[PDB]
Amino acid sequence: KVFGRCELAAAMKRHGLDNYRGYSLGNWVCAAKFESNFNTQATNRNTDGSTDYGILQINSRWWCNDGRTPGSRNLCNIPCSALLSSDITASVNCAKKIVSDGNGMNAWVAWRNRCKGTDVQAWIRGCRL
Ligand SMILES: O=C1O[C@H]([C@@H](O)CO)C(O)=C1O
Ligand code: NA
Known part of the structure; x- marks a missing residue:
């Protein structure tokens, strides 16, 4: 599923992301834009052999099991494919664990750089929330 901007904002808000660990909703929307272009099906292979999955490009090295990332972890306890669903629940729950991991949203390279x-409030401007 490819989300509209305001559509994803509302979904993220409903799932408890707005100010989660102090990151306002616009931060999450901005991250998702630059990680996946709001596309739940986005996948991208990393040089180390791991893969990033879903609207927040969560990686198989630490966070999910894709059956092909030797010696990696599954810290969110989920198959990576669950991060591609049109239901963002798994991506949200896993993001919450990630953002609590010590580096905050710096865990998302594209958040830090973009x-x-x-x-970031520009990303939720005009949305009914
Ligand atoms: O993504 C993963 O891949 C490996 C394994 O399933 C295949 O090597 C593993 O233990 C993960 O969490
Ligand atoms: Na893994």
């Missing part, structure tokens, strides 16, 4: 220090 969203951090920018006017």
Whole structure:
């Protein structure tokens, strides 16, 4: 599923992301834009052999089992494919674990490089929330 911007904002808000660990909703929307272009089906292979999955490009090295990432972990206790569903629940629950891991949203390279220090509230502007 490819989300509209405001559609994803509302879904993220309903799933408890707005100010989760102090990151306002716009941060999450901005991350999702630059990680996946709002597409739940996005996958991208990493140089180390792991793969990133879903709207927040959660990686198989640590967070999910894709059956092909030797010596990796499954810290969210889920098959990576669950991160591709049109229901974002798994991606949200797993994101919450990630953002609590010590580095906050810096865990998302694209957040740090495209969203951090920018006017992230622009991403939820005009949305009914
Ligand atoms: O993604 C993973 O891949 C391996 C295994 O399933 C295949 O090597 C593993 O233990 C994971 O969490
Ligand atoms: Na894994």
